[PDB]
Design a protein around this ligand. Structure first.
Ligand SMILES: *[C@@H]1O[C@H](CO)[C@@H](O)[C@H](O)[C@H]1NC(C)=O
Ligand SMILES: *[C@@H]1O[C@H](CO)[C@@H](O)[C@H](O)[C@H]1NC(C)=O
Ligand SMILES: [Ca+2]
Length: 463
């Protein structure tokens, strides 16, 4: 049962490869033109196509850089490795796919650049504002000897950095970092405050680490008094904590959703009192650095990925690019499939697959294997195609303007292949009255200076 490679009526080696990854092509030259050309390599070999003429590329995945994951008890010896492998060379056929895998293992503490964006509006009692200050001092005192880095920004009507990352690293003293804070006692411009942090606090000159996890703890006691968008803070993991009587109604709590990351059930936290601020972050802190999540950069438009995750105790979750509830030294893995659509023009592209908050990454160098190697001697104007009327690449003719056929001979389109038996009017007769040649199931009459020959079967001579 002639399958996809044979059926599609292909006219060259390139679109034969473009039919399907399983298709191979024969370029024998010496072969009855109406023989099969695009088929599986086994079927091509089953007929007597010259075995060395067969073109059958195969997609492949080759590991280039495969530093092993670092173990627990790791000194910075050529730095630590948390993603393996780190570079892979992918070669893909037209519309083909190829799987690969990566192990991820959090070897190090986990670098987090955390910003406190705390409400300083007029609604806060002097004690409540102090509870917020002591909350931040508590968090920083509890995390002094970790890879956490802290910045704090008070916002009301205005936005003010009380200290940034370079200030925290330099002093490491929560009391001294916050001693100058004066309660603003004004409005609640949450939109502009989040934009301020995203562009004016998360900056490398001010101590921010470019590969660290960006976290935003927003503490507020009322709805925002400004408006706009926070597109500039899309790359920051944003928690928001609404505290007090102004978030009693579920309506008021829902206004906070657009400020926090998704889903709101994870990143929006509602409290009735400021006393519960100590215990609340204690639980938040457990989900900040306990999750590996794959992040795809520079993925070409013609490429699509699918992920199957093995997330501790061999729970094989199809669809997931993340695993949560991880500890130091745990190892997870992801099976990744990359399918291309057709064949892009730029034949070499790269992209990155990286865990959020990691410097380690997997770079995937892609090359698309679409052309046939028999473009070597493609013989334009070949004597196999009516002398000039066709280019002879890969053992067949690619017909120039006008002409058609196996050899570029049939000129005016026969269209419907039908049969050569439509060249003689009845079963046993010779074709074209013996005054012409059957070309693509249609008679083409012998030319003579003695007179024209016409008719469907070249029966009429005009002397
Ligand atoms: C800070 O914590 C790390 C974590 O083990 C420890 O190795 C280091 O000695 C601590 N520093 C001080 C000054 O205690
Ligand atoms: C994910 O698992 C499904 C079912 O086992 C399989 O069909 C698919 O190829 C897998 N994908 C990858 C990228 O391994
Ligand atoms: Ca308020």
């Amino acid at each position: 049962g002639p399958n996809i490679c044979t059926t599609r009526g292909v006219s060259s080696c390139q679109q034969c490869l473009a039919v399907s990854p399983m298709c191979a092509w024969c370029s024998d030259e010496a072969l009855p033109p109406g023989s099969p050309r695009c088929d599986l390599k086994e079927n091509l070999l089953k007929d007597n196509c010259a075995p060395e003429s067969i073109e059958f590329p195969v997609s492949e995945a080759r590991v280039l850089e495969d530093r092993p994951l670092s173990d627990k008890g790791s000194g910075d010896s050529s730095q630590v490795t948390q993603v393996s492998p780190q570079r892979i060379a992918l070669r893909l056929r037209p519309d083909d796919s190829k799987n690969f895998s990566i192990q991820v293992r959090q070897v190090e503490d986990g670098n987090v650049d955390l910003v406190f964006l705390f409400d300083g509006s007029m609604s806060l009692q002097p004690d409540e504002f102090q509870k917020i200050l002591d909350f931040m001092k508590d968090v920083m005192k509890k995390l002094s000897n970790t890879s956490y880095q802290f910045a704090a920004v008070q916002f009301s009507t205005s936005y003010k950095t009380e200290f940034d990352f370079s200030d925290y690293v330099k002093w490491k003293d929560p009391d001294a970092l916050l001693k100058h804070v004066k309660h603003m006692l004004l409005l609640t411009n949450t939109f502009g405050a989040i934009n301020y942090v995203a562009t004016e606090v998360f900056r490398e000159e001010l101590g921010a680490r470019p590969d660290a996890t960006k976290v935003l703890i927003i503490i507020t006691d009322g709805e925002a008094t400004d408006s706009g968008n926070i597109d500039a803070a899309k790359d920051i993991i944003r928690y928001i904590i609404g505290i007090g009587k102004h978030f009693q109604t579920k309506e008021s709590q829902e206004t906070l959703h657009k400020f926090a990351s998704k889903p709101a059930s994870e990143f929006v936290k509602i409290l009735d009192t400021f006393e519960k601020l100590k215990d609340l972050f204690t639980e938040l802190q457990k989900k900040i650095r306990s999750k590996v999540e794959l992040e795809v950069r520079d993925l070409p438009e013609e490429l699509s990925l699918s992920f199957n995750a093995t997330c501790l105790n061999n729970e094989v979750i199809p669809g997931l690019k993340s695993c949560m509830g991880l500890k130091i030294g745990d190892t997870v893995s992801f099976s990744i499939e990359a399918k291309v659509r057709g064949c892009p023009q730029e034949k070499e592209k790269s992209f990155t697959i990286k865990p959020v908050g990691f410097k380690d990454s997997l770079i995937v160098q892609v090359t698309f294997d679409c052309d046939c190697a028999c473009q070597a001697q493609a013989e334009p104007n070949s004597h196999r195609c009516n002398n000039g009327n066709g280019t002879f690449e890969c053992g067949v003719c690619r017909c120039g303007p006008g002409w058609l056929g196996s050899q570029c001979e049939c000129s005016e389109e026969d269209y419907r292949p039908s049969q050569q038996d439509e060249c003689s009017p009845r079963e046993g007769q010779p074709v074209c009255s013996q005054r012409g040649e059957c070309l693509c199931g249609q008679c083409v009459c012998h030319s003579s200076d003695f007179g024209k020959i016409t008719g469907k079967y070249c029966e009429t001579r005009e002397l």
